[PDB]
């Protein structure tokens, strides 16, 4: 065994090894291993991405105009975000400026995805770590109604409703076919909600499962379908016609009316169901404001997103701020430059790839994706792994660093960056949330805080949907209908050699696509995706990434039942297909 120190942690792989494989209620394939001491405290954590497809390899030699469609299939959960980063990258490379309406629509697509993705994560992915579904069978329906009504104006709260939900659950498990609830962690001592709160939460799980399908109708109007809507280099393909013959063949007033109806409903659900539930989880699980901090009090990163000035990606345009904090110095939000070879770099010394020198990092314009499955001296064998060897290569995920620092990305990271840049709406929201919980601001830097920030961001995005919709309508009233720029559509108009960066904030954090075009074809296409950051393996200095750090020092009640591990991992909303691409 070995022990070493990094980032304030003592990484010690002596003692008992626990493996969680598969990790469920995530996207894609992940393995986690930890070592625990005699006191049931994690002293070592190992994050492993257990899938790879090779989109960066597949994109070589393709037409840049087609790239968005391929990279959108990196992920069907965060569907659309990779298409957006791709059209941004190709437009940056070629020198294309899109019309204002295209920019507004793209912003609507991204905000729609934030709302959808954050809602589904909260209920369907993370919720069962906090809500004891079987304990809902012991609730009193009237007391459940009284609780729900004390927390929200949401209409659906009658005692008869909660009784009907409880009876549906009772019937579901009566035949012994527990389905997704089979062999869960029900009754674990870390489940702290009273029965009435479990029944309230379970009712809302079901309401969210139904309602989420409606949100993505916005993607169907502008993008044809969800999952995996359509896009173009140069704007969007959804031509607008409000008042001319043939409006039946275009985005017309009836289509825009449908979008408006969805926006309203979406905001209502988020504000009156998800936000009060997130706060309720906080109220009953305050100790989790001190668990899972990881890198969130050290190093956080946002690129920024939602340019309000079309084709302007600078600080005065981006509605979701960018910046980096290192060394726990939140007084110094640093600017990020995705072209600077000394900023974003990826390491593969602990990953299943070949580099000419694995002791150095490569900026994505110098990136290499040369897969090499080499797990070395595992316990077991290369096709029957009992224990990964984290001293050697142990993941399909590359290790991104920012100026050599290991960073956390995602909703908590963004919230911290915006708060400390002085964004008034963010400061007011965070302050009011933490005051409601009687917790210090530092309580957000935690597993509980990741969940609270995700809910805050869903509310923020729902509000921005209305703002963007109103901007689109203002342009249409002014006779500004354009949705595509086509003067550089044809390859003969492009530079013979050019390169570009497309970046945004996906639901899970900072996303970048780096593209080089030569002779009309993709010459290089490298992606660094939010879960690549968070689920990163170690680097040549032994620095650990966000997941491994967040798990360090965690107490487990029952080593064989990984509920505390799952809580913290799910708080980051892992997307493993994204991470590996």
């Amino acid at each position: 065994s070995t022990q070493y120190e990094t980032q304030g942690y003592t990484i010690n792989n002596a003692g008992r090894r626990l493996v969680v494989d598969p990790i469920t209620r995530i996207q894609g394939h992940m393995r986690c291993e930890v070592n625990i001491n005699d006191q049931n405290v994690i002293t070592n954590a190992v994050s492993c991405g257990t899938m790879f497809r090779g989109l960066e390899i597949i994109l070589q030699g393709r037409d840049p105009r087609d790239a968005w469609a391929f990279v959108e299939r990196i992920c069907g959960v965060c569907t659309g975000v990779h298409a957006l980063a791709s059209v941004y990258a190709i437009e940056d490379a070629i020198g294309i400026k899109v019309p204002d309406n295209a920019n507004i629509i793209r912003n609507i697509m991204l905000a729609t995805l934030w709302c959808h993705d954050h809602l589904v994560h909260f209920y369907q992915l993370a919720g069962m770590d906090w809500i004891d579904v079987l304990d809902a069978l012991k609730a009193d329906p009237r007391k459940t109604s009284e609780l729900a009504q004390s927390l929200s104006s949401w209409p659906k709260s009658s005692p008869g409703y909660f009784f009907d939900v409880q009876n549906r659950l009772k019937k579901f498990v009566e035949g012994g076919q527990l389905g997704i609830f089979r062999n869960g962690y029900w009754g674990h001592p870390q489940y702290k909600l009273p029965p009435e709160a479990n029944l309230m939460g379970f009712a809302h799980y079901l309401e969210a499962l139904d309602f989420q399908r409606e949100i993505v109708k916005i993607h169907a109007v502008f993008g044809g379908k969800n999952p995996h809507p359509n896009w173009i280099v140069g704007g969007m393909p959804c031509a607008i016609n409000i008042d001319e013959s043939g409006a039946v063949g275009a985005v017309n007033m009836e289509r825009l009316n449908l979008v408006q109806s969805i926006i309203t409903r979406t905001a209502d659900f988020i504000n009156n169901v998800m936000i009060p539930d997130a706060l309720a989880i906080g109220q009953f699980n305050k100790p989790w404001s001190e668990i899972g901090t990881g890198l969130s009090d050290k190093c956080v990163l946002s690129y920024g997103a939602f340019p309000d000035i079309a084709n302007d990606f600078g600080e005065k345009s981006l509605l979701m701020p960018g910046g980096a904090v290192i060394n726990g110095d939140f007084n110094n939000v640093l600017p990020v430059d995705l072209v600077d070879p000394q900023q974003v770099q990826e390491f593969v010394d602990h990953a299943w790839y070949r580099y000419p020198n694995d002791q150095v990092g490569r900026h994505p314009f110098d990136g290499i994706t040369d897969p090499w499955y080499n797990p070395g001296d595992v316990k077991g064998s290369d096709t029957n792994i009992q224990q990964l060897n984290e001293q050697e290569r142990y993941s399909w995920i590359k290790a991104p660093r920012w100026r050599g620092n290991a960073m956390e990305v995602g909703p908590l990271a963004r919230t911290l960056i915006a708060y400390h840049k002085g964004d008034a709406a963010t400061v007011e929201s965070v302050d009011r949330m933490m005051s409601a919980l009687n917790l210090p601001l530092s309580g957000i830097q935690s597993t509980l805080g990741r969940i609270l920030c995700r809910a805050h961001e869903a509310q923020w995005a729902a509000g921005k949907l209305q703002y963007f919709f109103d901007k689109l309508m203002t342009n249409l009233k002014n006779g500004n209908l354009a949705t595509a720029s086509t003067e550089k559509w044809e390859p003969a108009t492009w530079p013979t050699e050019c390169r570009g960066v497309g970046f945004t904030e996906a639901p899970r954090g900072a996303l970048g696509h780096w593209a080089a075009i030569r002779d009309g074809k993709i010459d290089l296409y490298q992606c660094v995706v939010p879960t690549t950051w968070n689920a990163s393996p170690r680097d040549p200095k032994g620095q650990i990434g966000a997941y491994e750090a967040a798990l360090m020092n965690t107490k487990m009640a029952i080593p064989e039942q990984p509920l505390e591990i799952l809580r913290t991992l799910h708080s980051f909303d892992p997307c493993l297909a994204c991470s590996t691409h």
């Binding site: 969680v20 494989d21 598969p22 990790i23 469920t24 209620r25 996207q27 894609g28 394939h29 393995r31 497809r53 090779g54 390899i57 597949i58 037409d63 105009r65 087609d66 299939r73 990196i74 992920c75 069907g76 589904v120 369907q124 549906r168 579901f172 076919q177 389905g179 997704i180 089979r182 062999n183 869960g184 029900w186 499962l209 399908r213 109708k217 169907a220 109007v221 993008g223 044809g224 379908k225 999952p227 995996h228 359509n230 896009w231 140069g234 969007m236 393909p237 031509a239 001319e244 063949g249 275009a250 897969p371 499955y373 797990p375 077991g380 354009a482 595509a484 086509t486 039942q561 799952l566």
Partner: protein, 263 residues
């Protein structure tokens, strides 16, 4: 008792699971609670790790010969299968164990049916569709990237209601939804017939909903229900929102040339 279903995931983006939960009628909630017993599913299940392995083992043992296997994604043959690892072993081992006890297999999506994006040139992982690995079980292919939500749920309801597999074409696709081409039921066919085409994005033709053939539409060679059933509770489909069909329900569609090259 409800029919047991085991849903496994190989190399995939999860677009097919996501499509399923978009179903408008029946709601996915009602499929899960009342129509089937969804007994294993990595995306949604409470149990993880050893507890999830116990579920998988228990279900395929207790319900051997009696469960339906749903597959999303596909197995990679490269690197001894370790481009997709489940419980420390190649995913293909889990696929073969699950398949052996299944009464029938539903290959959701273009990934499970044909290969989809990871199998596009140069197919770095040697991603392989289900029917090239499992050769001794009925396999219903439900292609598309992803398939239409309400097609997925209609196929499920058909099977439960009628207690039989849907009739299929020579490629294993259900005739009900895959018997005709996009272009055989496309509302822009009047324009195709008249030679009325979009020539550049957001031109006057685009603003009148003219045909997308010259913009690369692959509807003429693609079998699916998108131009009839449409997407997301009938709200739209690719062509209606102004983009040509990519061909996403057809084998090898990624490698049939640029999406913007004419069919």
């Amino acid at each position: 008792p409800r029919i047991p279903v085991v849903w496994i995931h190989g190399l995939e983006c999860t677009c097919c699971t996501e499509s399923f939960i978009r179903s408008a009628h029946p709601l996915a909630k009602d499929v899960i609670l009342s129509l089937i017993s969804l007994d294993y599913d990595d995306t949604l299940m409470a149990a993880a790790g050893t507890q999830a392995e116990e579920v998988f083992e228990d279900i395929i043992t207790q319900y051997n010969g009696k469960y339906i296997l749903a597959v999303e994604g596909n197995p990679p043959l490269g690197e001894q299968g370790m481009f997709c690892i489940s419980s420390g072993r190649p995913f293909i081992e889990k696929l073969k164990r699950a398949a052996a006890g299944a009464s029938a297999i539903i290959a959701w999506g273009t990934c499970a049916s044909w290969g989809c994006v990871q199998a596009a040139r140069p197919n770095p992982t040697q991603a392989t569709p289900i029917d090239k690995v499992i050769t001794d079980k009925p396999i219903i292919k439900v292609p598309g990237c992803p398939p239409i939500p309400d097609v997925m749920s209609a196929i499920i309801t058909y099977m439960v209601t009628f207690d039989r597999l849907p009739d299929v074409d020579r490629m294993g696709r259900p005739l009900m939804f895959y018997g005709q081409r996009i272009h055989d039921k496309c509302y822009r066919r009047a324009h195709f017939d008249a030679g009325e085409f979009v020539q550049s994005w957001d031109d006057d033709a685009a603003r009148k909903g003219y045909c997308l053939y010259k913009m690369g539409c692959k509807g003429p060679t693609t079998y699916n229900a998108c131009s009839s059933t449409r997407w997301n509770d009938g709200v739209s489909f690719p062509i209606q929102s102004g983009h040509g069909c990519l061909g996403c329900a057809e084998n090898g569609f990624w490698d049939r040339g640029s999406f913007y090259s004419r069919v």
